[PDB]
Amino acid sequence: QVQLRESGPSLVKPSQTLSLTCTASGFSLSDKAVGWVRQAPGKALEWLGSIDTGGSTGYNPGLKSRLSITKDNSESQVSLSVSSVTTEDSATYYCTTVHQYTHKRCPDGYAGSSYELYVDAWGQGLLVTVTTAPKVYPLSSCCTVTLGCLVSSYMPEPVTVTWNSGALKSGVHTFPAVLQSSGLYSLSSMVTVTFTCNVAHPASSTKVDKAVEP
Amino acid sequence: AVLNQPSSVSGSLGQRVSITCSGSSSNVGNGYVSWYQLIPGSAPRTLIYGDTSRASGVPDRFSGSRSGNTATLTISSLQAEDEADYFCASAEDSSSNAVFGSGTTLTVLGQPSVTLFPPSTEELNGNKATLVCLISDFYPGSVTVVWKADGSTITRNVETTRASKQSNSKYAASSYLSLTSSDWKSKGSYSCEVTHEGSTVTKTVKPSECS
Secondary structure, three states: OOEEEEEOOOEOOOOOOEEEEEEEEOOOOOOOEEEEEEEOOOOOEEEEEEEOOOOOEEEOHHHOOOEEEEEEOOOOEEEEEEOOOOOOOOEEEEEEEEEEEEEOOOOOOOOOOEEEEEEEEEOOOEEEEOOEOOEEEEEEOOOOOEEEEEEEOEEOOOOEEEEOOOOOOOOEEEOOOEEOOOOOEEOEEEEEOOEEEEEEEOOOOEEEEEEEOO | OEEEOOOEOOEOOOOEEEEEEEOOOOOOOOOOOEEEEEOOOOOOEEEEEOOOEEOOOOOOOEEEEEEOOEEEEEEEOOOHHHOOEEEEEEEOOOOOOEEEEOOEEOOEOOOOOEEEEOOOOOHHHHOEEEEEEEEEEEOOOOOEEEEEEOOEEEOOOEEEOOOEEOOOOOEEEEEEEEEEHHHHOOOOOEEEEEEEOOEEEEEEEOOOOOO
């Protein structure tokens, strides 16, 4: 089918440029238009910009100065550049396909302009947070069974948790982290019944494997 | 800028509710509104585009309508599945510039367990210890976490996460007690007393009697 894979750094530092790449699998870039939409933590969806098929560009006027969007048909990828970032630009960034059309509107006998844009398909959203590797601890209960896999002290968000290389999809509940006073997150991923949980952290590029037994 | 929405709305289960989205004669007045559903943990899905047309896989229970400068999304037969943040949107001044709504928070009114973990043996080797109390599937999402040590209440190092929407329209949370291995053996018993609509579900672990 049609999906949009967002790829880029999940951490940037102030007064530098954040770059992202959207990989398009399932459709052509000379067939559909691509748009960028971000949501700030506690805010509304904010329009960023769009590039159609014909290579023309259009952005949110407030952020046109700091924005730039290009694409490469051959790689079937679209790029985004947000310059001179500040601590508020940390947000979830969604890659999307948009359908744009300027409808004309003349009187009822026969100029005018009525503009249309909407999002067709949404990406999944990677949260750029504007480095700390996690420490993994196995968990088991005191004397069905319940097994744990505690990820300890990591920055920035997020971490992706699986069990046995994606082969265990059952009874798993990954939890929302806590914001400790130290500013280091800590989340857990319970499983309820040779159990290795695989934890990855995109910022530190770390991948560890910790087995859990009672 | 942004479109006006009630930010917070409430309706009852199986009934009918309506979310207003009002703007100018340059955005909503042109009248090509879109609607979107954002459930936490999932991607935003497109609901209605061009005022009234429903998108792929969108049942006709979600009906888009418009009256001049105020578009209105109406959800018929509410379900727990429908609790989310709904955003409207229309283009302004160009085909390449969109504005979104503030987004309202849909609440379905009529709808009606915690495992406790000790710190890993590996963690106590750095003389650090972390009590993990994971609560899940309670509704609604208002829980009072109180740690208990030998009948007394603990205040230091209490770290609790806010309630979070799960896939099953249920709210789950996590609470962390970051201690050291020294005073972890000091008390004789530790209790994680969570309260949910007056009921107290308690999980307890004792340091010696757990190894």
